[PDB]
Nucleic acid binder design. Structure first.
Ligand SMILES: [Ca+2]
Ligand SMILES: [Ca+2]
Ligand SMILES: [Ca+2]
Ligand SMILES: [Ca+2]
Lengths: 223, 226
DNA sequence: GACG
DNA sequence: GACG
């Protein structure tokens, strides 16, 4: 274990103005902080297919809408139900120093070490979040936090279970034979991610501990 | 209007170790911050009964579990699904200065003025939160914030809708009267905060009007205990 | 009452 | 791939 046992997993999901090729900006951020004990206490899914796991009783949640500096791409606005104009009309603030202070205080309430988990996080959420934080004078709140990509995790878990798309929805439906709800809301998709990570909680925690890496090593999506 | 038009309503719900006579401590806190426009964006249904309204798309959320400094009362533990032992196994921190810093930073993201809305808040959540903040070595982040009790609000809205002494204004009683459905996730902070949001979305314009007329400073809320 |  |  490169960094010991992770005591908190923080499921991260972002909405944004678009895809990496577009130099996107964040428009919504959700964190679900779950203690490793809560994950390892998830009851063993029985049946075929198993029911969607119940979220743990104890889950710290932070869900925020964020005004971007540029317009949302048409597809992004359609699927997320957000737009720059409506966010501004409702007085949503930019990704700013106060937000970094907020994140710091929320992270500080979680037992360490702590590991972010995001779906395709290594190619999307982590680099994007690194870019957003790099714009601020405030030192990054994530410099002591770890991260892993849940696509890699589920590939490993599924591989061990049965020696295929790994999109969030494809996995959820494969595991549970249900359709994800509130797709492309940061909280809806974060909850779906939590559910897939609860499919085999012990195995997931084991993989996370083995593959956690410092968020400080994530390269910004763009400069 | 005593304090202008409220730009954000923050629906507040707490779970705690017990009821007032027990000098309770907070074990869970949820804030749902909704811009006044967002409440107004609620689609108007003309069904009878109307369907439970969708929450607005834009709603900032903060939901936190908090370890108390004494055991939960057995009744509170059963009702809430929380216990000091389980909060502690899961590494929850106390209601401390960092929590106030977190609350302060969250409140700053909301367009001002903000008005807290809690069900029986005048007799429970507001005095309890005032008590918890008063223990800290950091300034309360609520001295520039306003508050109202949704029991008074719904009594007023229901009376105006059908010109009340013979009914309950408990959270679930109102919800069922308006929507003919049972509330879900009762006695979780977020679950009941969402139920409260739904009852406040029943008649959004009338609710906002009443809130503007009755908002009072949180700084004037007397602590539950000292 | 109504809040846990 | 898969992320909005
Ligand atoms: Ca995502
Ligand atoms: Ca998403
Ligand atoms: Ca309550
Ligand atoms: Ca409650």
């Amino acid at each position: 274990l490169p960094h010991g046992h992770m005591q908190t997993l923080i499921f991260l999901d972002l909405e944004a103005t678009g895809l990496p090729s577009s130099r996107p900006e964040v428009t919504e951020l959700c964190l679900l902080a779950v203690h490793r004990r809560a994950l390892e206490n998830t009851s063993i899914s029985q049946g075929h297919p198993p029911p969607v796991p119940r979220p743990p009783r104890v889950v710290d949640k932070l869900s925020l809408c964020i005004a971007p500096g540029k317009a949302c791409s048409p597809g992004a606005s359609e699927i997320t139900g957000l737009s720059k104009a409506e966010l501004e009309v409702q007085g949503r603030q930019r990704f700013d120093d106060n937000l970094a202070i907020l994140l710091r205080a929320f992270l500080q309430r979680q037992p360490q070490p702590c590991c972010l988990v995001a779906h395709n996080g290594d190619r999307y959420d982590f680099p994007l979040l690194q870019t957003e934080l790099a714009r601020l004078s405030t030192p990054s709140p994530l410099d002591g936090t770890f991260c892993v990509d849940s696509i890699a995790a589920l590939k490993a878990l599924e591989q061990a279970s049965s020696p295929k798309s790994y999109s969030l929805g494809s996995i959820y439906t494969r595991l549970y034979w249900q359709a994800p709800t509130d797709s492309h809301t940061a909280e809806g998709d974060d909850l779906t991610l939590l559910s897939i990570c609860q499919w085999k909680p012990q195995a997931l925690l084991q993989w996370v501990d083995e593959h956690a890496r410092p968020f400080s090593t994530v390269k910004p999506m763009y400069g």
